[PDB]
C-alpha cells in the first residue's frame, strides 16, 4: 500500500473511533462505526490473498449486520424518546438491539463466529488493530448506555463468551486463533463487570490492550504465526522466549503479574453486589485460558523444540524491526500489580 494512503486510512480508523467516543448524538455514533469499518477493510486486505478477502467479507457482513441493528435501536429510541442524546435508552427493545449490535461488534459469543476466522485471515499488525483498537468504540457505547442494559442479557453474553473463548483456544495451534479466543474470553470478563463497576471494565480493557499489544508485537518481532514456529525462538532470540513466558503467564491471571489485576478487581466488584456463584464460575473457567497459555509457554520457553539447520544463518542477522514500545509494554503487562490502586484514575 502507498504509505500516504496507509497513513490516511489509519487516521480514518482512529477518526471513526474518536467520533464514537466524543459525540453526544446517536447518528454520529453510527457514522463513527461506519467510518471505522469502511476504513479498516483495506487494512485487512493489505496483502491481497484469498484469506484476507474471505476475512474481509466475513468482517464486512458481521459489522454491517451489527450496524443495521444499531441503527434500528437508534430509531426505536427516537420513537420512544423523541431525541438523539447518547445516554440511556428509553425502550427495552432498543436496549436489546443495541446490546446485540455491540456484542456483534465486539465478537462476544454467541456472535463470536467471526473473530478466529477474521483474525487468522489477516496479518498480525491488522489483527492487532482488530483485537485492540476495535474494542474501544463498542465499549464506549456500552459505557454510555449501562442504565438501560438488561442485566440477564449482558451477563449471559459475558459468561457465554468466557466459556466459549476458554474452550476454543484449547484446540488451536495457530497463534492468531489463540489470540482471538483469548479476546472472546476477555471481552466476557469486561462486560460481566459492566453493570457493577464500569471502572473495572475500563481497567480490564486497558490491561488487556497492553497484554495483547505485547503479544502481537512479540509475534511480529519474531515473525511467528504458528505455535510450532514460535517454538524456534529459543534458537534465534532467547530473550523473546522470556518475554512471551512472562506475558503469557500474565495473561492467564497469575499473581504477582498485572493480568491478575483486572480479574481480581472484577471479583472484588461482583462479590460486593452479592454475586458469588458468577465470578467463581468465571475464575474457574479462566483456567482454560491459562491452560492454552501454558501450552504456548511449554512449546516456547520452558522446553526447547528441535530447530532446523537454516537457523544458523539467522544467527548472523539482527532484528531491524520497529519493535515499537515492546519493552515498555512488556514491563507494563507484567510488573504493574504493585500499582493496582492506579485504577482510580479511570473513575
Amino acid at each position: 500500500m502507498n504509505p500516504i494512503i496507509l497513513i490516511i486510512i489509519l487516521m480514518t480508523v482512529m477518526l471513526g473511533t474518536i467520533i464514537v467516543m466524543i459525540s453526544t448524538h446517536w447518528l454520529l455514533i453510527w457514522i463513527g462505526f461506519e467510518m471505522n469499518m469502511l476504513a479498516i477493510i483495506p487494512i485487512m486486505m493489505k496483502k491481497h490473498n484469498p484469506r484476507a478477502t474471505e476475512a474481509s467479507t466475513k468482517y464486512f457482513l458481521t459489522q454491517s449486520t451489527a450496524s443495521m441493528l444499531l441503527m434500528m435501536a437508534i430509531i426505536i429510541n427516537l420513537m420512544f424518546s423523541g431525541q438523539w442524546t447518547v445516554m440511556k435508552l428509553f425502550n427495552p427493545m432498543a436496549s436489546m438491539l443495541m446490546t446485540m449490535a455491540l456484542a456483534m461488534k465486539l465478537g462476544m459469543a454467541p456472535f463470536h463466529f467471526w473473530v478466529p476466522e477474521v483474525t487468522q485471515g489477516i496479518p498480525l499488525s491488522s489483527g492487532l488493530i482488530l483485537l485492540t483498537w476495535q474494542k474501544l468504540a463498542p465499549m464506549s457505547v456500552l459505557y454510555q448506555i449501562l442504565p438501560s442494559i438488561n442485566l440477564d442479557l449482558i451477563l449471559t453474553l459475558s459468561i457465554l463468551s468466557i466459556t466459549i473463548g476458554g474452550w476454543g483456544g484449547l484446540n488451536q495451534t495457530q497463534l492468531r486463533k489463540i489470540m482471538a479466543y483469548s479476546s472472546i474470553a476477555h471481552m466476557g470478563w469486561m462486560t460481566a463487570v459492566l453493570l457493577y463497576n464500569p471502572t473495572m471494565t475500563l481497567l480490564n480493557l486497558i490491561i488487556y490492550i497492553i497484554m495483547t499489544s505485547t503479544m502481537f508485537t512479540l509475534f511480529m518481532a519474531n515473525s511467528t504465526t504458528t505455535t510450532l514456529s514460535l517454538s524456534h525462538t529459543w534458537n534465534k532470540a532467547p530473550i523473546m522466549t522470556i518475554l512471551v513466558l512472562i506475558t503469557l503467564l500474565s495473561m492467564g491471571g497469575l499473581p504477582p503479574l498485572s493480568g491478575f489485576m483486572p480479574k481480581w478487581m472484577i471479583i472484588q466488584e461482583m462479590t460486593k453486589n452479592d454475586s458469588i456463584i458468577l465470578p467463581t464460575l468465571m475464575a474457574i473457567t479462566a483456567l482454560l485460558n491459562l491452560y492454552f497459555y501454558m501450552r504456548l509457554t511449554y512449546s516456547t520457553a520452558l522446553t526447547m523444540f528441535p530447530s532446523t539447520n537454516n537457523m544458523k544463518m539467522k544467527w548472523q542477522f539482527p532484528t531491524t524491526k520497529r519493535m515499537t514500545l515492546l519493552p515498555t509494554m512488556t514491563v507494563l503487562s507484567t510488573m504493574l500489580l504493585p500499582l493496582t490502586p492506579i485504577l482510580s484514575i479511570l473513575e
Binding site: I239, L326, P327, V331, P338, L339, I342, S344
Partner: protein, 120 residues
C-alpha cells in the same frame, strides 16, 4: 461510580481542587517503583536489540527512567485526587443523611451474650 462528579468539569486530568491536596513526594515509593519500571524497560530494550544490557545506551535508559517518573508523578497525583474525592463525597453524604447512618451504641461484653462452642 464517580462519573457524575467529573461531568461538570470534563476532560480535566487534574482539576483546580486537586491543587488543595499535597502532591506526592519525589521520594514516593510508588514513584520509585515506577522509576524502577523505567529502568527495567531500558534493560529489556537493550536486551531485545542485543546490546550489552547494563552498559549500552545510558542516555536511553536514563530517558526511560525520566519518562516513567514524569508520567507516574501525574498518575499518582490523579490517583490521590480521585481517592480524596471518594472520601469527600462519602463524608458529605454521611453528614447530609443522618437518618441513614444512626449512631450505634456499642455494648460492652458484660451485656453481649455470645454462645460458647466448646472444642472437645
Amino acid at each position: 461510580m464517580m462519573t457524575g462528579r467529573q461531568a461538570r468539569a470534563p476532560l480535566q486530568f487534574l482539576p483546580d481542587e486537586a491543587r488543595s491536596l499535597p502532591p506526592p513526594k519525589l521520594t514516593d515509593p510508588r514513584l520509585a517503583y515506577i522509576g524502577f519500571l523505567g529502568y527495567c524497560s531500558g534493560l529489556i530494550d537493550n536486551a531485545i536489540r542485543r546490546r550489552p544490557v547494563l552498559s549500552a545506551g545510558l542516555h536511553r535508559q536514563f530517558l526511560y527512567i525520566t519518562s516513567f517518573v514524569f508520567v507516574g508523578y501525574y498518575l499518582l497525583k490523579r490517583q490521590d485526587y480521585m481517592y480524596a474525592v471518594r472520601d469527600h463525597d462519602m463524608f458529605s453524604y454521611i453528614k447530609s443523611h443522618p437518618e441513614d447512618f444512626p449512631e450505634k451504641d456499642k455494648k460492652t461484653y458484660r451485656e453481649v451474650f455470645e454462645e460458647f462452642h466448646p472444642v472437645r
